[PDB]
Design a protein around this ligand. Sequence first.
Ligand SMILES: [Mg+2]
Ligand SMILES: [Mg+2]
Length: 127
Amino acid sequence: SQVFGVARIYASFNDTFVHVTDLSGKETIARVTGGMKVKADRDESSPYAAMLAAQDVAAKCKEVGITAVHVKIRATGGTRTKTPGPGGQAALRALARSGLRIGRIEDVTPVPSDSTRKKGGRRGRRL
RNA sequence: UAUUUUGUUGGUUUCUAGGACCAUCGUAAUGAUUAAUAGGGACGGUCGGGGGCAUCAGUAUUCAAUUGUCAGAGGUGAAAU
Ligand SMILES: [Mg+2]
Ligand SMILES: [Mg+2]
């Protein structure tokens, strides 16, 4: 049968993390980010650097033995936006298209039961 | 109270001066307005994120301990700290 890992795509703004672990989550198999793949440090959040991160993560899942993966897409959460950034779906498309098999897609963004006053003041972040 | 009379005031003075019995020989329809689409109170089943005290839970955040992994991570319009 297939051997499953967990993809654990933290797609924030300003960066994307593709982090395959084992089924327990305690062993890391190729955490690769977008700033490892682009040198402009605004394109870390871009769909392009997510694609190059996810394809090399998929290229290290093979030679280790991971053939299929559960994905855990994940925005910043907490007091932040709760909206996954521009590279989550690009990382998902690349990791699905680069030889791995996918099952059990879920979103795991950390949501409070309202807690911990948001950063920015009362008038907000005014530009 | 006698005002009029008996021995000038004077006690008892008189079927005539009281609230005490009511004593014309004890009568009356005997005597308390509603119940405000005012108010207050009570009662009934309720209703509510009304209040106080105690208690319970939830993730999130921050930090810590253990763990795995390896060059970036944060952050922005772009940066830099
Ligand atoms: Mg602020
Ligand atoms: Mg404006």
